Amino acid sequence: MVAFGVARQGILRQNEQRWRWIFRSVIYEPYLAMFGQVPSDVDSTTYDFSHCTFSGNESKPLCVELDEHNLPRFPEWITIPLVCIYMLSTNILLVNLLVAMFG
Amino acid sequence: QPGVQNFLSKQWYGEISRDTKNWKIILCLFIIPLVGCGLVSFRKKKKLLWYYVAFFTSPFVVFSWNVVFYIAFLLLFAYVLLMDFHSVPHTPELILYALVFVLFCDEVRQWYMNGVNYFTDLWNVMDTLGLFYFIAGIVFRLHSSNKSSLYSGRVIFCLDYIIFTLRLIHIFTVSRNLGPKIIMLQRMLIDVFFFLFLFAVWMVAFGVARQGILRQNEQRWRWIFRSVIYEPYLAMFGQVPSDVDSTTYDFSHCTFSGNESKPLCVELDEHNLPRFPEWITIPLVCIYMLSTNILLVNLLVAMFGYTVGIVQENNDQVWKFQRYFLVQEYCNRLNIPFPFVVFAYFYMVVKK
Amino acid sequence: YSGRVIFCLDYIIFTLRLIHIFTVSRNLGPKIIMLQRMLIDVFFFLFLFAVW
Amino acid sequence: YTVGIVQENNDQVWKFQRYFLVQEYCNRLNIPFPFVVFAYFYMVVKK
Numbered sequence: 161m162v163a164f165g166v167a168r169q170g171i172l173r174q175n176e177q178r179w180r181w182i183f184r185s186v187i188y189e190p191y192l193a194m195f196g197q198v199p200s201d202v203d204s205t206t207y208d209f210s211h212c213t214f215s216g217n218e219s220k221p222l223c224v225e226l227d228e229h230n231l232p233r234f235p236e237w238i239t240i241p242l243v244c245i246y247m248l249s250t251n252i253l254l255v256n257l258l259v260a261m262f263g
Numbered sequence: 264q265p266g267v268q269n270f271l272s273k274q275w276y277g278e279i280s281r282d283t284k285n286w287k288i289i290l291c292l293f294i295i296p297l298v299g300c301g302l303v304s305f306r307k308k309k310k311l312l313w314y315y316v317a318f319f320t321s322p323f324v325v326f327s328w329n330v331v332f333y334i335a336f337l338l339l340f341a342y343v344l345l346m347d348f349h350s351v352p353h354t355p356e357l358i359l360y361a362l363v364f365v366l367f368c369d370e371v372r373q374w375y376m377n378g379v380n381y382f383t384d385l386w387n388v389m390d391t392l393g394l395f396y397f398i399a400g401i402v403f404r405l406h407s408s409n410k411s412s413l414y415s416g417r418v419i420f421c422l423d424y425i426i427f428t429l430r431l432i433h434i435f436t437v438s439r440n441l442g443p444k445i446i447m448l449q450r451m452l453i454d455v456f457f458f459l460f461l462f463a464v465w466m467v468a469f470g471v472a473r474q475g476i477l478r479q480n481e482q483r484w485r486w487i488f489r490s491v492i493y494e495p496y497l498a499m500f501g502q503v504p505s506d507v508d509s510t511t512y513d514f515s516h517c518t519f520s521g522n523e524s525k526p527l528c529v530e531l532d533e534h535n536l537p538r539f540p541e542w543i544t545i546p547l548v549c550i551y552m553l554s555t556n557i558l559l560v561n562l563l564v565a566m567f568g569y570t571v572g573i574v575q576e577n578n579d580q581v582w583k584f585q586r587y588f589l590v591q592e593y594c595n596r597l598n599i600p601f602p603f604v605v606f607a608y609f610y611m612v613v614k615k
Numbered sequence: 616y617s618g619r620v621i622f623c624l625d626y627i628i629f630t631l632r633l634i635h636i637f638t639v640s641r642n643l644g645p646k647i648i649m650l651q652r653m654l655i656d657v658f659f660f661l662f663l664f665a666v667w
Numbered sequence: 668y669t670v671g672i673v674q675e676n677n678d679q680v681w682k683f684q685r686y687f688l689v690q691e692y693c694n695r696l697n698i699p700f701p702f703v704v705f706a707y708f709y710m711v712v713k714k
């Protein structure tokens with residue numbers, strides 16, 4: 161959880177400077193991903209925006225940094241495999257291992 | 264056998280008595296003033312100086328101190344990476360560089376002591392890769408004029424952090440409560456590979472068929488691989504593989520031609536209605552979901568149970584054999600604390 | 616369109632032969648063989664599920 | 668339960684199956700698949 165959350169927060173958003181949302185993104189969402197929902201809907205550029213906040217005026221997550229042309233800068237070909245691997249490692253193998261040890 | 268284990272334990276605890284409980288010594292570690300008291304019974308071969316010097320030479324305390332230092336380094340790395348990163352590095356980043364430098368010096372010592380047999384171990388390869396990635400990240404980041412280099416260096420550092428963080432599993436294989444369970448993970452690769460093989464076969468078949476019988480002449484590799492592979496894989500944990508198999512809900516997300524970044528539309532007929540039949544698509548998806556989500560996972564659970572039952576008895580002696588190497592390697596070095604080790608080597612070149 | 620659908624189903628049929636031709640790996644083959652011995656449990660589960 | 672019961676017995680069945688593969692492959696002419704078509708081409712000529 162710690163590894164994936166730190167990496168994902170690092171390669172998407174820049175200089176949050178707010179402990180609340182830092183711990184909300186690093187820990188809470190990956191933990192929630194263990195039972196059901198995919199860890200993040202932000203890894204894909206197809207659906208995004210309208211929930212962003214430039215600066216920290218409002219109570220919403222910090223936005224993904226843009227480029228000279230005002231497009232998302234992060235590449236998907238490293239984010240998507242990362243989340244796939246994390247979900248496969250956590251949701252499936254670990255629970256089944258726990259079941260076996262309990263038995 | 265018990266004799267060798269007792270010998271190793273006595274060598275590991277150093278001067279300190281083997282009967283002293285662990286929590287007492289840990290608590291004494293945090294607060295130094297209780298070293299000169301009855302907190303811990305040395306039971307080993309003016310008085311205060313000897314009591315203190317012997318305390319900072321046992322490999323147990325050195326290992327605990329190094330663990331604490333590693334955790335602090337990880338915390339600082341995370342804080343710098345995702346909370347303070349600018350074009351021109353600040354003092355915390357310089358401190359991080361110094362810590363990485365001392366770690367690199369320790370790795371150089373490890374290289375010197377051994378030879379090419381050193382690289383046969385997997386964790387050594389991981390550590391070397393992490394160091395090289397850190398160096399590359401520095402090289403990219405020092406280009407302040409161009410912003411893209413800064414972003415690239417940040418990504419490199421994030422991946423290096425991923426690599427570094429996993430070492431906690433390796434360094435905690437000596438707890439005597441978790442280590443035996445960590446060791447057994449090496450014996451479950453074949454079941455995983457078999458499960459992945461079957462899953463991939465089914466995934467490829469279903470994705471190819473579904474893409475073929477719905478959409479025509481995509482001519483875009485991105486969406487081809489997005490539809491053939493990604494969605495069926497995602498279907499394994501939860502969501503139904505596709506919401507497109509049903510004609511009731513569709514449209515408003517289509518794109519005639521490839522002007523936009525959306526999936527290609529389902530081909531229509533003379534009357535401008537969907538052409539694919541549902542009575543073959545729906546059973547196909549039902550069968551795929553039943554085959555993948557349920558049977559395969561339960562089979563994997565059963566195989567894991569059998570393997571654990573078989574190997575539980577044998578795991579313990581392997582764990583002890585591994586424990587021996589740790590004790591020997593730690594006893595070899597000078598046992599100086601990690602942050603202050605750099606000074607020692609400083610004079611080796613002077614003396615050699 | 617009908618021919619395209621027929622070819623898609625034929626592709627589905629063809630693809631599964633990889634399971635048969637890989638039963639000689641000496642690491643996966645033994646596990647592939649045992650799948651023949653789990654039909655009755657599946658049928659019983661399906662029977663109860665269908666009734667409910 | 669079924670896996671635990673049948674794991675011991677599975678191996679000899681696997682070996683028995685392996686035999687058939689080896690025999691069947693040893694029977695043919697062992698020419699590569701893409702170039703096999705030429706061989707049969709002359710069988711009708713020779714038979």
Ligand SMILES: CC(C)CCC[C@@H](C)[C@H]1CC[C@H]2[C@@H]3CC=C4C[C@@H](OC(=O)CCC(=O)O)CC[C@]4(C)[C@H]3CC[C@]12C
Nearest residue numbers: 234235236237240241244245248485488489492493496
């Ligand atoms: C790790 C294993 C066990 C899971 C199976 C692997 C697949 C889920 C991964 C492997 C490589 C991945 C692909 C690597 C690269 C791309 C291109 C990507 O699109 C882009 O990168 C757009 C580029 C841009 O930003 O302009 C869409 C996903 C795809 C097909 C990825 C989707 C998922 C794939 C097939």
Ligand SMILES: CC(C)CCC[C@@H](C)[C@H]1CC[C@H]2[C@@H]3CC=C4C[C@@H](OC(=O)CCC(=O)O)CC[C@]4(C)[C@H]3CC[C@]12C
Nearest residue numbers: 162166182186334337338341342431435438439440441
């Ligand atoms: C902003 C983010 C990046 C902060 C990072 C959180 C850290 C405080 C986490 C990262 C790894 C965690 C550690 C992972 C493993 C362990 C060992 C664990 O103790 C044992 O497993 C041994 C028990 C025994 O054998 O008796 C106690 C928690 C600790 C230090 C965890 C506590 C908190 C740590 C240091």
Ligand SMILES: CC(C)CCC[C@@H](C)[C@H]1CC[C@H]2[C@@H]3CC=C4C[C@@H](OC(=O)CCC(=O)O)CC[C@]4(C)[C@H]3CC[C@]12C
Nearest residue numbers: 285289323326327328330331332334335437438439440
């Ligand atoms: C916010 C952060 C700074 C709090 C985390 C504090 C850590 C430095 C503490 C929490 C749990 C502690 C660990 C709990 C148990 C053990 C095992 C202990 O002894 C052994 O390694 C086992 C030897 C044996 O069994 O014979 C050495 C210290 C260690 C890792 C302790 C060292 C310090 C740890 C990691």
Ligand SMILES: CC(C)CCC[C@@H](C)[C@H]1CC[C@H]2[C@@H]3CC=C4C[C@@H](OC(=O)CCC(=O)O)CC[C@]4(C)[C@H]3CC[C@]12C
Nearest residue numbers: 241245385389429432433434436445446447448449450
């Ligand atoms: C195809 C490539 C480009 C994608 C990268 C995939 C990596 C994330 C995979 C490849 C090999 C994997 C590693 C293979 C072996 C192990 C050891 C495993 O822990 C143990 O088995 C401990 C055993 C022991 O202590 O002796 C934890 C995961 C790790 C690091 C695996 C985690 C993920 C790794 C690095």
Ligand SMILES: CC(C)CCC[C@@H](C)[C@H]1CC[C@H]2[C@@H]3CC=C4C[C@@H](OC(=O)CCC(=O)O)CC[C@]4(C)[C@H]3CC[C@]12C
Nearest residue numbers: 510538539540541542543545546547549550553661665
């Ligand atoms: C494969 C087993 C283990 C799962 C249980 C089977 C049912 C989920 C399948 C079997 C046959 C299926 C039916 C076959 C045909 C149709 C008609 C179909 O509607 C149309 O075909 C409209 C025709 C048109 O396009 O004009 C709606 C679903 C239904 C009832 C299918 C829904 C699901 C059924 C009952």
Ligand SMILES: CC(C)CCC[C@@H](C)[C@H]1CC[C@H]2[C@@H]3CC=C4C[C@@H](OC(=O)CCC(=O)O)CC[C@]4(C)[C@H]3CC[C@]12C
Nearest residue numbers: 456460463464467471487491633637639640641642643
């Ligand atoms: C656009 C789509 C249709 C492209 C299709 C993807 C192919 C590249 C996939 C289809 C089936 C896959 C194969 C299914 C089974 C295997 C065997 C597997 O190796 C083993 O299982 C044996 C290992 C051992 O016993 O030692 C390696 C991958 C491979 C060739 C898979 C790799 C990639 C293949 C050829």
Ligand SMILES: CC(C)CCC[C@@H](C)[C@H]1CC[C@H]2[C@@H]3CC=C4C[C@@H](OC(=O)CCC(=O)O)CC[C@]4(C)[C@H]3CC[C@]12C
Nearest residue numbers: 633635636637638639640641642643644645685688689
């Ligand atoms: C993009 C595509 C073209 C890459 C896939 C390359 C395949 C042609 C490679 C990948 C894995 C290979 C396989 C890995 C392991 C084996 C088992 C090997 O020996 C056995 O069959 C076992 C015999 C025994 O155990 O005694 C024969 C080749 C095969 C299938 C290899 C043949 C070629 C394969 C399928």
Ligand SMILES: CC(C)CCC[C@@H](C)[C@H]1CC[C@H]2[C@@H]3CC=C4C[C@@H](OC(=O)CCC(=O)O)CC[C@]4(C)[C@H]3CC[C@]12C
Nearest residue numbers: 546550628631634635636638647648649650651652684
């Ligand atoms: C009711 C009808 C019209 C729907 C079509 C359902 C098919 C998709 C089902 C019917 C029979 C099934 C097959 C029955 C047996 C097997 C073998 C099974 O693999 C093994 O058991 C290997 C055993 C060995 O190697 O000896 C994998 C699935 C397959 C092809 C099943 C997969 C799906 C099939 C073709």
